[PDB]
């Protein structure tokens, strides 16, 4: 008696079968899954004239909630339903249209860049359509398909209509990246890279999964900016923010050079108003495109611990404090060096100086360790310099305090960054971290929005799916097939800021990390707490780094080494296996499988196409696609729940039907001594800083309170293994 509205817009009487047939399909080859469940769960409410599209969308969200530990398969069921639904809005039918017709039509619509037709010919598109395997859309998971549907797929924001499939994404993104390649190997890479991203072998950032083949050439995930102690530099840094924030890219401010409050200006014509006043200006700049004033644009501000206004900066994210002196919309990262921790252990005081009062003391902080201990102790006895004595035990407590309450206050060991980094602490020292704290690239203050001398550290992210390769030797292909794609991107994309282009084309740095690490250890039957993976972690990453350098090495001969390279340690015949924390030889003995002395001579001649090739970053959005564990972070639960944007999606861990025992859920670990112990081993082969985060469960401590004794313990433990930085500090709620 009731009627329904079909997609085309035709109307026919309601028929249950139509739903039964569909659900029965996606349920094919699945177990512990029942068709009736979805239908009733859906509580679908028929009503005269109901659009068939709505009915489909309701059943999908139904089988979506089914996903559970008892019946995981459901998350392939919903996924299959989602893709079927997507194929309707994209092509009006399940069977996808010719790769060539699809690009042509889109170009006329203004979806894909018109260069695709000027770089490739019709005869070639038909040749690439063969590599495509639309049957790979079923290898996805509800958690993955849901992401592509919301963001990754090229779809109208206003209407919400889809325009392409998951496969057309990979085939195109790889092709654009290799567009400027020789006709002899141009199509070649397009295939291998395609069967590398579609097969879940390599994970690519959100700005990349979406953009390439979009007219927009903006693929920068985040930008690091170093602000100088000037009004001109501040405005330049502020304007630089408003530029990238509108591009939805993370920001990494260092105001740590701004003189403290009370500091005299131009001899004494005026006194500094303080840091807080300026810090706020930066926030609004990051929120300038945020909706409401609340959410979006993420920016981490850094500064030295020995700073004079440190005590006033650590409590910025704290409520108490009228806004006059507060900033709860920005993250922070207290920079610490060896000397600092020393004063803590001995329970000795820390002198709080100012950047202007102590000349060279600031630069010593990163570029040189010994000079710092000489100047610091020097300015301490000097009474002609404003300072302040504070117990190292108290300062470190106030930091961990705000770090435990907010869980945003990050830590950055500048000594390790300049101790074991590709960059020469004398020419291009690391004095910054990106929002996530994974990047460690040099930066320079800008005198204006278009300053030439300025250098805005930029980077290209990527990662290897450890749960996709059989052996470590398989990284040999992925490495070269990855470094090239990213390297070419640096030239494919544009730069809205001179300083940005300067550093981008200068050292051409890249950030390639790893994903699905949890599953990796699961297969080999390893854990974190016990640390029975220290050797494995050493061997695995040893290759990950070897092949990356070996890849950027061969690339250098073909296109030359980066222009600024002489700056890098690699030029002076220096490898990470030399400047690594010697204290790592107490938690691992895994020898070098790969003959680096060989790469040493190779790089010492041609160099590297890129300055930095290895970065470990936290990747939930990217990993969700490969249905893998976010970055190296262990699964919070067998069936972690991620809510985005509109609704939470249940994502079951990989190979749960056979790995249930193996996995060591985050909450479940005794402490962090085991986790951080692995990060230090990884850093031994990372040119860039791992965004490792701590974890604390008040249920494992007496009085249901986390003791400050343990907080400082892990902090020192990490520093002992060369841990560069510390990300979040998840507190079990």
């Amino acid at each position: 008696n009731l009627l329904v509205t079909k997609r085309d817009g035709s109307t026919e009487r309601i028929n249950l079968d139509k739903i039964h047939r569909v659900l029965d399909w996606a349920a094919e080859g699945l177990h512990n899954v029942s068709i009736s469940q979805v239908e009733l769960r859906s509580h679908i409410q028929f009503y005269d004239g109901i659009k068939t599209s709505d009915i489909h969308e309701t059943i999908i969200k139904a089988a979506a909630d089914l996903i559970s530990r008892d019946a995981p398969d459901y998350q392939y069921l919903a996924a299959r339903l989602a893709i079927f639904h997507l194929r309707k809005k994209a092509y009006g039918q399940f069977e996808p249209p010719a790769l060539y017709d699809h690009v042509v039509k889109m170009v006329e619509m203004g979806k894909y860049d018109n260069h695709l037709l000027e770089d490739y010919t019709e005869e070639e598109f038909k040749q690439m359509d063969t590599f495509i395997d639309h049957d790979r859309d079923m290898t996805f998971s509800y958690a993955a398909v849901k992401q592509l549907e919301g963001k990754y797929l090229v779809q109208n924001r206003v209407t919400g209509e889809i325009y392409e499939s998951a496969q057309f994404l990979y085939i195109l993104v790889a092709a654009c990246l290799f567009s400027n390649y020789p006709r002899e190997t141009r199509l070649q890479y397009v295939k291998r890279f395609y069967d590398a991203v579609s097969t879940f072998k390599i994970s690519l950032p959100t700005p990349i999964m979406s953009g390439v083949r979009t007219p927009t050439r903006q693929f920068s995930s985040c930008v690091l900016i170093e602000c100088g102690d000037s009004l001109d530099s501040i405005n330049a840094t502020s304007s630089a923010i408003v530029k990238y924030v509108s591009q939805r890219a993370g920001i990494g401010i260092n105001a740590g050079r701004i003189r403290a409050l009370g500091s005299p200006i131009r001899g004494g014509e005026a006194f500094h108003t303080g840091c807080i006043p300026f810090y706020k200006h930066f926030q609004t700049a990051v929120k300038s495109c945020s909706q409401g004033g609340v959410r979006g644009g993420a920016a981490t501000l850094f500064y030295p611990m020995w700073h004079l206004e440190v005590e006033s900066l650590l409590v910025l994210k704290n409520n108490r404090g009228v806004e006059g002196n507060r900033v709860r919309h920005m993250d922070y990262g207290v920079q610490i060096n060896k000397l600092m921790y020393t004063r803590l252990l001995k329970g000795e005081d820390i002198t709080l100086f100012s950047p202007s009062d102590v000349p060279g003391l600031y630069d010593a902080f990163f570029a040189d360790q010994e000079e710092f201990e000489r100047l610091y102790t020097k300015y301490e006895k000097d009474d002609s310099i404003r300072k302040q004595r504070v117990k190292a035990v108290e300062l470190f407590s106030l930091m961990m305090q705000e770090r435990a309450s907010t869980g945003r206050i990050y830590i950055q060991n500048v000594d390790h960054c300049n101790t074991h980094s590709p960059f020469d602490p004398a020419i291009a020292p690391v004095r910054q971290s990106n929002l996530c704290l994974e990047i460690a690239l040099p930066t320079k203050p800008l005198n204006d929005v278009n300053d030439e001398n300025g250098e805005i550290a930029l980077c290209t992210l990527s990662a290897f799916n450890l749960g996709a390769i059989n052996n470590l030797d398989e990284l040999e292909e992925l490495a070269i097939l990855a470094v090239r794609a990213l390297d070419a991107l640096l030239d494919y994309q544009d730069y809205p800021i001179p300083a940005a282009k300067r550093g981008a084309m200068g050292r051409r740095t890249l950030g390639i990390g790893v994903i699905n690490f949890a599953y990796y250890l699961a297969k080999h039957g390893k854990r974190y707490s016990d640390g029975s993976a220290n050797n494995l972690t050493h061997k695995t990453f040893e290759a990950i780094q070897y092949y990356l350098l070996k890849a950027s090495n061969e690339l250098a001969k073909e296109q030359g080494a980066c222009p600024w390279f002489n700056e890098t340690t690699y030029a002076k015949g220096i490898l990470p296996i030399d400047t690594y924390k010697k204290d790592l030889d107490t938690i691992a003995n895994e020898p070098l499988h790969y003959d680096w002395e060989a790469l040493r001579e190779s790089i010492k001649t041609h160099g590297l196409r890129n300055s930095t090739l290895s970065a470990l970053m936290p990747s939930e959005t990217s990993s969700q696609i490969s249905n893998a564990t976010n970055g190296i972070e262990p699964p919070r639960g067998y069936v972690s729940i991620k809510a985005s944007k509109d609704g939470i999606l249940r994502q079951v861990v990989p190979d749960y039907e056979h790995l249930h025992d193996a996995y060591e859920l985050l909450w479940e670990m005794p402490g962090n001594d085991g986790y951080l112990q692995l990060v230090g081993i990884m850093q031994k082969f990372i040119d860039q800083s791992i965004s490792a985060n701590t974890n604390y469960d008040p249920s494992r401590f007496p009085s249901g309170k986390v003791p400050m004794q343990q907080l400082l313990k892990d902090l020192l433990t990490a520093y002992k293994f060369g841990v560069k930085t510390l990300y979040y500090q998840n507190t079990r709620d």
Binding site: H31, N32, V33, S34, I35, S36, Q37, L40, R41, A71, K338, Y341, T342, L344, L345, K346, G347, V393, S397, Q401, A404, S405, P698, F701, S703, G704, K705, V706, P707, M708, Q709, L712, K713, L716, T717, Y719, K720
Partner: protein
């Protein structure tokens, strides 16, 4: 068993069939070498 082994086809039928510690010690951490 006359019929082939199978997972239950209607699991729904079973629904009707039943703070921060401030503690600091210098000596305990002084033994930790950086």
């Amino acid at each position: 068993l006359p019929f082939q082994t199978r997972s239950n086809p209607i699991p729904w039928i079973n629904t009707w069939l039943v703070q921060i510690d401030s503690e600091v010690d210098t000596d305990d951490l002084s033994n930790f070498q950086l």
